[PDB]
Write an enzyme that holds these catalytic residues in place. Structure first.
Site, PDB file in Angstrom:
ATOM      1  CE  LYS A  89      -2.211  -1.504   3.712  1.00 36.97           C
ATOM      2  NZ  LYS A  89      -1.588  -2.840   3.617  1.00 36.97           N
ATOM      3  NE  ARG A 118      -5.731  -0.462   8.714  1.00 39.87           N
ATOM      4  CZ  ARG A 118      -4.444  -0.731   8.524  1.00 39.87           C
ATOM      5  NH1 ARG A 118      -3.923  -1.853   8.993  1.00 39.87           N
ATOM      6  NH2 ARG A 118      -3.641   0.170   7.973  1.00 39.87           N
ATOM      7  NE  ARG A 172       7.833  -2.691   6.656  1.00 36.75           N
ATOM      8  CZ  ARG A 172       6.564  -2.297   6.705  1.00 36.75           C
ATOM      9  NH1 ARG A 172       6.051  -1.584   5.707  1.00 36.75           N
ATOM     10  NH2 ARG A 172       5.799  -2.647   7.735  1.00 36.75           N
ATOM     11  NE  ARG A 231       5.979  -0.564  10.831  1.00 37.90           N
ATOM     12  CZ  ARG A 231       4.945  -0.407   9.998  1.00 37.90           C
ATOM     13  NH1 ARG A 231       5.063   0.374   8.939  1.00 37.90           N
ATOM     14  NH2 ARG A 231       3.808  -1.074  10.207  1.00 37.90           N
ATOM     15  NE  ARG A 239       1.602  -5.154  11.346  1.00 36.89           N
ATOM     16  CZ  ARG A 239       2.641  -4.830  10.589  1.00 36.89           C
ATOM     17  NH1 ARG A 239       3.831  -5.344  10.858  1.00 36.89           N
ATOM     18  NH2 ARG A 239       2.495  -3.979   9.583  1.00 36.89           N
TER      19      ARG A 239
HETATM   20  N1  LIG Z   1       5.495  -5.503  -5.509  1.00 38.54           N
HETATM   21  C1  LIG Z   1       6.403  -5.785  -4.559  1.00 38.54           C
HETATM   22  N2  LIG Z   1       7.230  -6.864  -4.665  1.00 38.54           N
HETATM   23  C2  LIG Z   1       8.152  -7.165  -3.742  1.00 38.54           C
HETATM   24  N3  LIG Z   1       8.305  -6.422  -2.642  1.00 38.54           N
HETATM   25  C3  LIG Z   1       7.499  -5.366  -2.415  1.00 38.54           C
HETATM   26  C4  LIG Z   1       6.566  -5.044  -3.381  1.00 38.54           C
HETATM   27  N4  LIG Z   1       5.849  -4.000  -2.999  1.00 38.54           N
HETATM   28  C5  LIG Z   1       6.373  -3.647  -1.819  1.00 38.54           C
HETATM   29  N5  LIG Z   1       7.368  -4.453  -1.455  1.00 38.54           N
HETATM   30  C6  LIG Z   1       8.099  -4.496  -0.163  1.00 38.54           C
HETATM   31  O1  LIG Z   1       7.292  -5.152   0.830  1.00 38.54           O
HETATM   32  C7  LIG Z   1       7.392  -4.505   2.107  1.00 38.54           C
HETATM   33  C8  LIG Z   1       6.041  -3.959   2.508  1.00 38.54           C
HETATM   34  O2  LIG Z   1       5.649  -2.922   1.567  1.00 38.54           O
HETATM   35  P1  LIG Z   1       5.044  -1.517   2.027  1.00 38.54           P
HETATM   36  O3  LIG Z   1       4.527  -0.759   0.847  1.00 38.54           O
HETATM   37  O4  LIG Z   1       6.130  -0.964   2.863  1.00 38.54           O
HETATM   38  O5  LIG Z   1       3.817  -2.061   2.878  1.00 38.54           O
HETATM   39  P2  LIG Z   1       2.371  -1.740   3.406  1.00 38.54           P
HETATM   40  O6  LIG Z   1       1.389  -2.525   2.629  1.00 38.54           O
HETATM   41  O7  LIG Z   1       2.259  -0.275   3.244  1.00 38.54           O
HETATM   42  O8  LIG Z   1       2.585  -2.343   4.807  1.00 38.54           O
HETATM   43  P3  LIG Z   1       2.342  -1.823   6.222  1.00 38.54           P
HETATM   44  O9  LIG Z   1       3.020  -2.669   7.210  1.00 38.54           O
HETATM   45  O10 LIG Z   1       3.135  -0.594   6.280  1.00 38.54           O
HETATM   46  O11 LIG Z   1       0.858  -1.685   6.477  1.00 38.54           O
HETATM   47  P4  LIG Z   1      -0.026  -1.848   7.707  1.00 38.54           P
HETATM   48  O12 LIG Z   1      -1.437  -1.725   7.295  1.00 38.54           O
HETATM   49  O13 LIG Z   1       0.204  -3.177   8.291  1.00 38.54           O
HETATM   50  O14 LIG Z   1       0.240  -0.979   8.877  1.00 38.54           O
HETATM   51  P5  LIG Z   1       0.164   0.496   8.974  1.00 38.54           P
HETATM   52  O15 LIG Z   1       1.466   1.156   9.060  1.00 38.54           O
HETATM   53  O16 LIG Z   1      -0.836   1.210   8.155  1.00 38.54           O
HETATM   54  O17 LIG Z   1      -0.512   0.576  10.447  1.00 38.54           O
HETATM   55  C9  LIG Z   1       0.309   0.289  11.608  1.00 38.54           C
HETATM   56  C10 LIG Z   1      -0.642   0.131  12.774  1.00 38.54           C
HETATM   57  O18 LIG Z   1      -1.409   1.340  12.941  1.00 38.54           O
HETATM   58  C11 LIG Z   1      -2.750   1.030  13.358  1.00 38.54           C
HETATM   59  N6  LIG Z   1      -3.706   1.420  12.309  1.00 38.54           N
HETATM   60  C12 LIG Z   1      -3.423   1.933  11.097  1.00 38.54           C
HETATM   61  N7  LIG Z   1      -4.564   2.195  10.464  1.00 38.54           N
HETATM   62  C13 LIG Z   1      -5.539   1.831  11.287  1.00 38.54           C
HETATM   63  C14 LIG Z   1      -6.914   1.910  11.079  1.00 38.54           C
HETATM   64  N8  LIG Z   1      -7.528   2.360   9.972  1.00 38.54           N
HETATM   65  N9  LIG Z   1      -7.690   1.484  12.109  1.00 38.54           N
HETATM   66  C15 LIG Z   1      -7.184   1.001  13.250  1.00 38.54           C
HETATM   67  N10 LIG Z   1      -5.869   0.954  13.431  1.00 38.54           N
HETATM   68  C16 LIG Z   1      -5.024   1.349  12.474  1.00 38.54           C
HETATM   69  C17 LIG Z   1      -2.757  -0.476  13.621  1.00 38.54           C
HETATM   70  O19 LIG Z   1      -2.223  -0.667  14.939  1.00 38.54           O
HETATM   71  C18 LIG Z   1      -1.703  -0.945  12.603  1.00 38.54           C
HETATM   72  O20 LIG Z   1      -1.179  -2.226  12.871  1.00 38.54           O
HETATM   73  C19 LIG Z   1       8.453  -3.432   1.917  1.00 38.54           C
HETATM   74  O21 LIG Z   1       9.721  -3.936   2.378  1.00 38.54           O
HETATM   75  C20 LIG Z   1       8.410  -3.151   0.411  1.00 38.54           C
HETATM   76  O22 LIG Z   1       9.684  -2.714  -0.023  1.00 38.54           O
END
Ligand SMILES: Nc1ncnc2c1ncn2[C@@H]1O[C@H](COP(=O)(O)OP(=O)(O)OP(=O)(O)OP(=O)(O)OP(=O)(O)OC[C@H]2O[C@@H](n3cnc4c(N)ncnc43)[C@H](O)[C@@H]2O)[C@@H](O)[C@H]1O
Ligand SMILES: [Zn+2]
Length: 217
Positions: free
Chosen positions: A13, A88, A127, A160, A171
């Site tokens: 994402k 979400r 990552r 992280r 998660r």
């Molecule tokens: N095509 C490809 N091929 C190969 N490799 C690739 C690739 N594309 C990318 N990659 C690699 O793969 C890896 C991942 O890609 P990357 O693009 O970095 O990943 P992402 O999908 O953005 O992953 P996140 O971990 O950052 O998302 P998340 O939803 O779990 O947590 P968030 O930070 O929002 O949220 C954190 C916390 O905040 C809270 N939170 C956030 N939003 C909410 C909400 N709406 N409601 C309640 N709690 C929330 C929760 O506690 C949550 O756990 C990287 O190393 C990248 O380089």
């Protein structure tokens, strides 16, 4: 153009969001980033979010909906926006319909980036992020030139706090239970579009750009 990027943790994402906002010049609104910013600043919300984030749990809906409502009210969202990681849960999606209607907007597309869970596990545990500039790498899929060092600034790479295997397992499970029902919710409204996220980064972006080109048609 009002868009939502939805997907299980590690689907890519944030990676795709950066490419999208760079091409259109619209704001990138990430709930995860907003929570991390509150945490660093030491605010009441950041202290609360920290406990949930560290465990891989979701932050309560009321709290999350509130910060999004406040963010979407700003003038910089007039030309459109990209919501990354919100909604979400069904409660969050219902709240979003209302919040947007209140400012006279409707969603265009909800882009669901689909990836198998086993792959997601590898996406997250491997990552590595630069502590200095925030650049993101992946030990398996796109490693830095030299181990532990950021290609961009020479900074230290680290994992992280929530990317360790145990936290990742939690998660994936909670996001699967809460977020998956959203596929059906959005299919019903006609906003949903599925994207195969198990492709190379440029290919995933090309699929998204192709989808978005239709809005200009
Ligand atoms: N095509 C490809 N091929 C190969 N490799 C690739 C690739 N594309 C990318 N990659 C690699 O793969 C890896 C991942 O890609 P990357 O693009 O970095 O990943 P992402 O999908 O953005 O992953 P996140 O971990 O950052 O998302 P998340 O939803 O779990 O947590 P968030 O930070 O929002 O949220 C954190 C916390 O905040 C809270 N939170 C956030 N939003 C909410 C909400 N709406 N409601 C309640 N709690 C929330 C929760 O506690 C949550 O756990 C990287 O190393 C990248 O380089
Ligand atoms: Zn760096």
């Amino acid at each position: 153009m009002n868009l939502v990027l939805m997907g299980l943790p590690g689907a890519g994402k944030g990676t795709q969001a950066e490419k999208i906002v760079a091409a259109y010049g619209i704001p990138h609104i990430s709930t995860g980033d907003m929570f991390r910013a509150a945490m660093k600043e030491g605010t009441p919300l950041g202290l609360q979010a920290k406990q949930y984030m560290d465990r891989g749990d979701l932050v309560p809906d009321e709290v999350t909906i509130g910060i999004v409502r406040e963010r979407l009210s700003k003038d910089d969202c007039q030309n459109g926006f990209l919501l990354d990681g919100f909604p979400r849960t069904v409660a969050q999606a219902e709240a979003l319909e209302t919040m947007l209607a209140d400012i006279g907007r409707k969603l265009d597309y909800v882009i669901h980036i689909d990836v198998r869970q086993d792959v997601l596990m590898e996406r997250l545990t491997g990552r590595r992020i630069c502590r200095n500039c925030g650049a993101t790498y992946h030990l398996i899929f796109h490693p830095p030139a030299k181990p532990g060092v950021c290609d961009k600034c020479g900074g230290e790479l680290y994992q992280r706090a929530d990317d360790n295997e145990a936290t990742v397992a939690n998660r994936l499970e909670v996001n699967m239970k809460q977020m998956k029902p959203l596929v059906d919710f959005y299919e019903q409204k006609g906003y949903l579009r599925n994207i195969n996220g198990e492709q190379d980064m440029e290919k995933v972006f090309a699929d998204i750009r192709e989808l978005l080109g239709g809005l200009a048609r």
